[PDB]
Amino acid sequence: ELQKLQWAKQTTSICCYCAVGCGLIVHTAKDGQGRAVNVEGDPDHPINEGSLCPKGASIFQLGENDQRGTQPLYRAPFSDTWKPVTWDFALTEIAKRIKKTRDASFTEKNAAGDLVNRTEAIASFGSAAMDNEECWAYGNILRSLGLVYIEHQARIXHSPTVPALAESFGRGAMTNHWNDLANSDCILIMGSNAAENHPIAFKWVLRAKDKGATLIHVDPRFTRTSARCDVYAPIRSGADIPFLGGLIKYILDNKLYFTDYVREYTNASLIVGEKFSFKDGLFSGYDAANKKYDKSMWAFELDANGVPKRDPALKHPRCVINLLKKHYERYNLDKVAAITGTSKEQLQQVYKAYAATGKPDKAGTIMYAMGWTQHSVGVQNIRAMAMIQLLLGNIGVAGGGVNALRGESNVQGSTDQGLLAHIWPGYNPVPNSKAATLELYNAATPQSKDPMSVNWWQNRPKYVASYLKALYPDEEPAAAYDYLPRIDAGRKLTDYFWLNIFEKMDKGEFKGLFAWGMNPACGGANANKNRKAMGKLEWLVNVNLFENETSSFWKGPGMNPAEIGTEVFFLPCCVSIEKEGSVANSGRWMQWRYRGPKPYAETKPDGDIMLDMFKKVRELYAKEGGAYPAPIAKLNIADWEEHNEFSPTKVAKLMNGYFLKDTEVGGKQFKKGQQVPSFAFLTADGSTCSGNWLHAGSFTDAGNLMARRDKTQTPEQARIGLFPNWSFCWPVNRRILYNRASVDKTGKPWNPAKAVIEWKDGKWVGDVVDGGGDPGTKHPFIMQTHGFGALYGPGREEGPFPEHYEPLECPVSKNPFSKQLHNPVAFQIEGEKKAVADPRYPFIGTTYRVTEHWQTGLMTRRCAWLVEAEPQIFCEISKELAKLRGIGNGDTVKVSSLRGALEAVAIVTERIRPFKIEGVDVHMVGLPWHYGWMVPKNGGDTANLLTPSAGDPNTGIPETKAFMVDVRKVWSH
Amino acid sequence: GKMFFVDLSRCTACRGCQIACKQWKNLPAEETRNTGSHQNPPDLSYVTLKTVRFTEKSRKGPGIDWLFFPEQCRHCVEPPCKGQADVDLEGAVVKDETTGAVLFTELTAKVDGESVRSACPYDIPRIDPVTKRLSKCDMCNDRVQNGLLPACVKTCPTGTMNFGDEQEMLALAEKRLAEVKKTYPGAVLGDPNDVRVVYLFTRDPKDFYEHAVA
Numbered sequence A: 001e002l003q004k005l006q007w008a009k010q011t012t013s014i015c016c017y018c019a020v021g022c023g024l025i026v027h028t029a030k031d032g033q034g035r036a037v038n039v040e041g042d043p044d045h046p047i048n049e050g051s052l053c054p055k056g057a058s059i060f061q062l063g064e065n066d067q068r069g070t071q072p073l074y075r076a077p078f079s080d081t082w083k084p085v086t087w088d089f090a091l092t093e094i095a096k097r098i099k100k101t102r103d104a105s106f107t108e109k110n111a112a113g114d115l116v117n118r119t120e121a122i123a124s125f126g127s128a129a130m131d132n133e134e135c136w137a138y139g140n141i142l143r144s145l146g147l148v149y150i151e152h153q154a155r156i157x158h159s160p161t162v163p164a165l166a167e168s169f170g171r172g173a174m175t176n177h178w179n180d181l182a183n184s185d186c187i188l189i190m191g192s193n194a195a196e197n198h199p200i201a202f203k204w205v206l207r208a209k210d211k212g213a214t215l216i217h218v219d220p221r222f223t224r225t226s227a228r229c230d231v232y233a234p235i236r237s238g239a240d241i242p243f244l245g246g247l248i249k250y251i252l253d254n255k256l257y258f259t260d261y262v263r264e265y266t267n268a269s270l271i272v273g274e275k276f277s278f279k280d281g282l283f284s285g286y287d288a289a290n291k292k293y294d295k296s297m298w299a300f301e302l303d304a305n306g307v308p309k310r311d312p313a314l315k316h317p318r319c320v321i322n323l324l325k326k327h328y329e330r331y332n333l334d335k336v337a338a339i340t341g342t343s344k345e346q347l348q349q350v351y352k353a354y355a356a357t358g359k360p361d362k363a364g365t366i367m368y369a370m371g372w373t374q375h376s377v378g379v380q381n382i383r384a385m386a387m388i389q390l391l392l393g394n395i396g397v398a399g400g401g402v403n404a405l406r407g408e409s410n411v412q413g414s415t416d417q418g419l420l421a422h423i424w425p426g427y428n429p430v431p432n433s434k435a436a437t438l439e440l441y442n443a444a445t446p447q448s449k450d451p452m453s454v455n456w457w458q459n460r461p462k463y464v465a466s467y468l469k470a471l472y473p474d475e476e477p478a479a480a481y482d483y484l485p486r487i488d489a490g491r492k493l494t495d496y497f498w499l500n501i502f503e504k505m506d507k508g509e510f511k512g513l514f515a516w517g518m519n520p521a522c523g524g525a526n527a528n529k530n531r532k533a534m535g536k537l538e539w540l541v542n543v544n545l546f547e548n549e550t551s552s553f554w555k556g557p558g559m560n561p562a563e564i565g566t567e568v569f570f571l572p573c574c575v576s577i578e579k580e581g582s583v584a585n586s587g588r589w590m591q592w593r594y595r596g597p598k599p600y601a602e603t604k605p606d607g608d609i610m611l612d613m614f615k616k617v618r619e620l621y622a623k624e625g626g627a628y629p630a631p632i633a634k635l636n637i638a639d640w641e642e643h644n645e646f647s648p649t650k651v652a653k654l655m656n657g658y659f660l661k662d663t664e665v666g667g668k669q670f671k672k673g674q675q676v677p678s679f680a681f682l683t684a685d686g687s688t689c690s691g692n693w694l695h696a697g698s699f700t701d702a703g704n705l706m707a708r709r710d711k712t713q714t715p716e717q718a719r720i721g722l723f724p725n726w727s728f729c730w731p732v733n734r735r736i737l738y739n740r741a742s743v744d745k746t747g748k749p750w751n752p753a754k755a756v757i758e759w760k761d762g763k764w765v766g767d768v769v770d771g772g773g774d775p776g777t778k779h780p781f782i783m784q785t786h787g788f789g790a791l792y793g794p795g796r797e798e799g800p801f802p803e804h805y806e807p808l809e810c811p812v813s814k815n816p817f818s819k820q821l822h823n824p825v826a827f828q829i830e831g832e833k834k835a836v837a838d839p840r841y842p843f844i845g846t847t848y849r850v851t852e853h854w855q856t857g858l859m860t861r862r863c864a865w866l867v868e869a870e871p872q873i874f875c876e877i878s879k880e881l882a883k884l885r886g887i888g889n890g891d892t893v894k895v896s897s898l899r900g901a902l903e904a905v906a907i908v909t910e911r912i913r914p915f916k917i918e919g920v921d922v923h924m925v926g927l928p929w930h931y932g933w934m935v936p937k938n939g940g941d942t943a944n945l946l947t948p949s950a951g952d953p954n955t956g957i958p959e960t961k962a963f964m965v966d967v968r969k970v971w972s973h
Numbered sequence B: 001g002k003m004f005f006v007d008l009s010r011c012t013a014c015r016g017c018q019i020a021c022k023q024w025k026n027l028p029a030e031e032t033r034n035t036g037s038h039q040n041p042p043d044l045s046y047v048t049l050k051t052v053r054f055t056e057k058s059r060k061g062p063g064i065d066w067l068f069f070p071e072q073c074r075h076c077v078e079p080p081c082k083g084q085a086d087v088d089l090e091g092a093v094v095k096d097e098t099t100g101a102v103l104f105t106e107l108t109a110k111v112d113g114e115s116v117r118s119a120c121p122y123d124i125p126r127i128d129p130v131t132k133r134l135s136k137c138d139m140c141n142d143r144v145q146n147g148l149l150p151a152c153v154k155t156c157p158t159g160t161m162n163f164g165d166e167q168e169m170l171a172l173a174e175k176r177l178a179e180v181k182k183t184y185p186g187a188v189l190g191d192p193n194d195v196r197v198v199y200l201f202t203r204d205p206k207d208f209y210e211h212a213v214a
């Protein structure tokens, strides 16, 4: 036997880094009682097959790191030093601060006299790094305390994907999964650097290519992804809608779209109202003064019976499809080439290659991430591609779909658990002030009088009611609905989001902040503003693995500890392999992982910290009372606990949900206590509880279906890699979403060789069908009100069709598409200057990742092997720029924006080349954002010193992918 | 015995192999800096047995030929490192007659290290100047003898890294050469009859590294 692994116990885990969800094998000394001795890949895991990228392969060195936090630390106001304290001291004092701060800022009624029952002076950041059970629990705790300012990674990451794909398909999630890439005939990677950022994914990408697939990378840079691709085209940052709109024109103009699919499955036939217009960058209904659209002007013309009108012949001039052709006729290769920098030759080659998947027996997939999301036009970037997939019949089919690649291991799951201001778990909207009662709440949910339109959201009252029974099972849903806090109906949703939280914090309007498993002094755009704003807090509770730029902002660069009155509690948590729980990968795969080592030193799981913290808040409210203490007193935390510790199992079972009384649901008999077998069996009347209705099916009487490790498949399942018996995905194990669009009227696969479902012997076989019902009898997009794939998407803040707008800081002063240079309703903050074609910041700035580092680098800048490979911040520039600025490869340079400045080592490379934009060379400067002032020595500081606090009007995501900088040689040392 | 087939047409230079080698052996990290390249550490050393070299070459039209090369001991069938070392002292370099592993022992401390390194056609051996011991890739012989894959082969996401019997891996190498040759006409196997680590190069091996082939 091997000396290293011999007396060690083997347990399985899932990777604590990216959303690929790679399987890990962990070996713990003294058959489990000592420290991890080894971590490597799980050879039996169906996604990674024992593979690990260098982040996964160095988890051992993360877990067994001596720089790890050992115990709680306290930083007194105006102190320059940490004081080691007890868990009892830290958590008792935090409860006193929570309580003091909540009592002084608790608003029962807003200005207008409406009920809101909310705390305005505390915000919470985090976290996609926590298990699903800790995420759910944390959000319920924060809301029982009446917080509305609840954000995490999702806001500044894939927030655009949710409304973008939900408008388009009804759901906001990744449409297929990782193993399904191997089934594609054309993989377009664009807004994504997947060989670096989702490495194990390239196993499946290259297997696609082995079996005939064309690989295309469109990116400002030549990357490690570009090297392993058949076609590489450059594109300028923030010029993706031109490209995609050019492709829409090309598909339509050459009749390369899938006619039958488009006619029956998309809203191509639906008739748009006479009020809808577009004229020189503005849609109908533009309020120039409020910088807001009147969406009423974009409604469909309705028949008498409430249903939107349809012309199946696609002839009516106000048919969605005829208005589509009209919108994108301006996107001719000459105009797209001038604005993207991408040659006509190259546009023609990519368009020809991708458009050929129009055929029914073909599937093109898109892999996209931050390159599309982190923009003022983020949502419209994604709609534009979502539209292209619908024209080509690529949604619902194997090797197709919209693979919006999730980042953090549980960002999917943390978004599921509603750790965002605008959503409760299960993506139920947080109630606004006009929703005075549970009836007025449910009255917002759109209704359909089309018999074929499933309109599944109509079931919401059951989920909302079951959720409220999950929190408060001894109270009527009507009564419990008054405990949870509300937002103002008057105000834009972005007033409750990340960027505005930091604007408020910087005007002294916040007293308290939970930085829970996040590092916003490096991760938040405009880091200088963020670092100053944290100074204006009374208290800060940082929960994390190591001391960091957030915890210790008070002794960061240009900071005098003695000027800063913030009280900071540093509370050290466990790593992933020290705790049991589930994490939701990009494929919605909810995977269960096991404890290897005992928690290091006096570190504690997040769940145990937040439960103990909450028990001290409740206990304090019992003793001395205060503002509206009901939601705190009555919150069901009994079901979160076993053996005086947080029980991830019990919480998973509650999130699945169970019966509170014996009841009859959907034509079946259920006995009190039984787990809810699926979300179809939840009730509005109060006989079912369920923390999250997407979880309804994950933990049945059968057992924990998330912890299933069964590679068994039917021959048709194995042909497209579904692995239905490996863990569990939402909803109800539908591995490929919208799979009803993968069959004709009669239920026959479009691509029989790669069938997702098929009607065979009065049953669907293959993947669980997404929408029950016999072939031809329903519309395949069951989460849509009208049941159709939306080419026209009238719910989106800047309009129903993507249109090109230059980034808020751009290199040109004129848009060749309209008089509207910028997004007409862009999220901006008053008096924050933007550099627009300014000779002081003449260069396009963008930020991005390398394979070896994770996020702000808080974790991996502590891992000697990852630092060894990528020791310092670098700046990627072209040979032509380096010539112009007298910068040699390896030279120190200063990169500056209007917001900040940093030094980096120049990497001069043909991998970046000038963009020819309107007959003028525009140079780009690229920076990684993985570095910060605390570790290592000479590592550098965050690129987010440079990035602007402005972004997408829908979701408030900042534009960290396109801004403007200068770069200059540094002559020092 | 055993053989690696390394398909550089599928390398993403993720540097998983680089990290996996250090995790298995618990090797210390070098102190590195960026000198204008992703490459780090810049070279093999006493404590780095595998690093991914990065070289930028030109091609027609857009982008570059980005050549990745995870460098490691070739585990020569007739190793010159052993010839040279045996002049001073036998037992310093031994052959595993089952796996084909060429293994350095503590006894390399008592031979002329600069000569062993200079004897290597691929310039692989590195000396601890403190201790005078030599280090390189040991083919994870420990793992191989207990029927496991080397750390770097197990960790590779892409199919770049392959390991097993010499017969299987030459057959795989020739199959993969024919297929890859369509996408890349300059593709070649590196000294396939002399080493146990056969690399598929997508163009002239020298472009990958000075000492890619003998």
Ligand SMILES: Nc1nc2c(c(=O)[nH]1)N[C@H]1C(S)=C(S)[C@@H](COP(=O)(O)OP(=O)(O)OC[C@H]3O[C@@H](n4cnc5c(=O)[nH]c(N)nc54)[C@H](O)[C@@H]3O)O[C@H]1N2
Pocket: A018, A019, A157, A190, A191, A192, A193, A194, A196, A197, A198, A218, A219, A220, A221, A223, A235, A236, A237, A238, A239, A240, A368, A369, A370, A371, A372, A405, A406, A407, A408, A846, A847, A848, A849, A850, A851, A852, A853, A854, A855, A856, A961, A962
């Ligand atoms: N190695 C590594 N992997 C990670 C992470 C990490 O930090 N490191 N983090 C994880 C997280 S949280 C996430 S969300 C994902 C992010 O995954 P990615 O999106 O891959 O991340 P980035 O590298 O930031 O950006 C992707 C690419 O977009 C390009 N790009 C920039 N601007 C534009 C533009 O305007 N248009 C287009 N078309 N492309 C543009 C950049 O050049 C870059 O190559 O990665 C996840 N995995």
Ligand SMILES: Nc1nc2c(c(=O)[nH]1)N[C@H]1C(S)=C(S)[C@@H](COP(=O)(O)OP(=O)(O)OC[C@H]3O[C@@H](n4cnc5c(=O)[nH]c(N)nc54)[C@H](O)[C@@H]3O)O[C@H]1N2
Pocket: A016, A127, A129, A130, A153, A154, A156, A157, A158, A370, A374, A407, A408, A516, A517, A518, A519, A520, A522, A523, A524, A525, A543, A544, A545, A546, A573, A574, A575, A576, A606, A847, A848, A854, A855, A856, A857, A858, A859, A929, A943, A944, A947, A960
């Ligand atoms: N310029 C620029 N800015 C960006 C981006 C970009 O591309 N460019 N990307 C954005 C994106 S996608 C994201 S997701 C954000 C990331 O922003 P942050 O989330 O602030 O990033 P980190 O804190 O570096 O990474 C996640 C944190 O999780 C912690 N963690 C790990 N395991 C645990 C655990 O068990 N418990 C707890 N409590 N914490 C744990 C790690 O210690 C780490 O601090 O950055 C965003 N900011």
Ligand code: SF4
Pocket: A015, A016, A017, A018, A019, A020, A021, A022, A048, A051, A052, A053, A054, A055, A056, A057, A198, A199, A200, A201
């Ligand atoms: S970081 Fe992502 S690709 Fe790498 S091992 Fe982890 S899950 Fe897999």
Ligand code: SF4
Pocket: B010, B011, B012, B013, B014, B015, B016, B017, B018, B052, B068, B070, B152, B155, B156, B157, B158, B160, B161
């Ligand atoms: S692990 Fe494989 S793909 Fe990654 S750098 Fe090494 S050989 Fe290449």
Ligand code: SF4
Pocket: B072, B073, B074, B075, B076, B079, B080, B081, B082, B102, B119, B120, B121, B122, B123, B124, B125, B136
């Ligand atoms: S590559 Fe060099 S060190 Fe390795 S076996 Fe061959 S001669 Fe010896």
Ligand code: SF4
Pocket: B020, B021, B022, B024, B049, B050, B072, B136, B137, B138, B139, B140, B141, B150, B151, B152, B153
């Ligand atoms: S075979 Fe073993 S020692 Fe050799 S490079 Fe791979 S992991 Fe390192």
Ligand SMILES: [S]
Pocket: A128, A153, A154, A157, A406, A407, A408, A411
């Ligand atoms: S993420």
Ligand SMILES: [W+6]
Pocket: A153, A157, A158, A406, A407, A408, A411
């Ligand atoms: W992310």
